[PDB]
Amino acid sequence: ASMTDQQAEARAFLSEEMIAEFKAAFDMFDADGGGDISTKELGTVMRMLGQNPTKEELDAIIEEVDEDGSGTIDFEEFLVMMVRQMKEDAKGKSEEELANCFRIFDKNADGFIDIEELGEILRATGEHVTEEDIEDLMKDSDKNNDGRIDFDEFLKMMEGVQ
Ligand SMILES: [Mn+2]
Ligand SMILES: [Mn+2]
């Protein structure tokens, strides 16, 4: 996974209209039409496009793309950094949402989802689920056989691979 290789993969990850959209903002900081912008403006374009890198993350990227000291970042490297950030942010969002999902499922707030809680939420979806079906989910997800799903087990059940 070389730079060019990473760059190829960053473009395949986005739709072309998204890429053109990203470049239209990036171009407003170029001016010289060189295809690059100052590393001092990278945080601003990234936030303009919905990303939220921390200052340490910004520092780390700049050090990664500015080894020759030109003080600029080109568009292709920009896309790589944007896809890195997108993936990190989206994963943060999913984790957050799963913790919310669990507090809701765990009706009595004991820190566990029991079969009663599990059946109540699945039946409320409107799907025609049977008690068999609920009990099958419980057994497959209950890794330590204590009859309930803790948060770790929940994460594993939901993310599936996990
Ligand atoms: Mn509970
Ligand atoms: Mn368990």
Swiss-Prot record:
It holds the Pfam family EF-hand_7. CDD domains: EFh (cd00051). Ca(2+) 2 binds at D66, D68, S70, T72, E77. Ca(2+) 3 binds at D106, N108, D110, E117. Ca(2+) 1 binds at D30, D32, D36, E41. This is Troponin C, skeletal muscle. One of its GO terms (biological process) is skeletal muscle contraction. GO terms for cellular component: troponin complex. It comes from Gallus gallus.
